[PDB]
């Protein structure tokens, strides 16, 4: 028993020291890498918060163009609120079940 348990805690400490040597460098490098990398990530994502445009007519400042487009999408959503029945999805999902019924018939 005792000579087999000793040989198990022997190999446990060997398997630990072979990791500890390599974990300690990585841990001493942790947060000074993390916070540089997070500063880089948020700054890099700001370069993608910027939709591309081709041959749209636009008048002055891009916020002032969005302000006037907003005043008209504030009529388009309000008109889908004047047009969407409580079953618009069930109707829109039936589309191809109707065609497979016809294909079977």
């Amino acid at each position: 028993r005792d000579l087999t348990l000793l040989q198990r805690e022997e190999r446990l400490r060997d398997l630990i020291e072979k990791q500890d040597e390599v974990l300690t460098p990585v841990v001493t490098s942790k947060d000074p890498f993390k916070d540089n990398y997070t500063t880089f990530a948020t700054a890099l994502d700001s370069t993608r918060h910027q939709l591309a445009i081709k041959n749209i007519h636009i008048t002055g400042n891009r916020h002032r163009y969005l302000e006037e487009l907003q005043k008209h999408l504030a009529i388009t959503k309000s008109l889908l609120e004047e047009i969407m029945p409580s079953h618009a999805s069930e109707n829109a999902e039936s589309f191809d079940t109707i065609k497979d019924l016809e294909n079977i018939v």
Binding site: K34, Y37, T38, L51, A52, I53, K54, I56
Partner: protein, 49 residues
């Protein structure tokens, strides 16, 4: 318990950064500029009604 603590300090960092990873990776393999507001082909035919 020290080797467990160092493993948790590292494996928790890989889950702290879990958003920042695919957010940096998004420029390394490129889901960007994919959709463009393009009027060049929008030759709208207004109906008689």
């Amino acid at each position: 318990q020290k080797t467990r603590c160092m493993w948790n300090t590292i494996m928790q960092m890989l889950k702290e950064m879990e958003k920042e990873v695919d957010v940096v990776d998004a420029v390394v393999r490129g889901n960007i500029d994919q959709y463009c507001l393009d009027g060049t082909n929008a030759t709208l035919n207004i109906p008689n009604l």
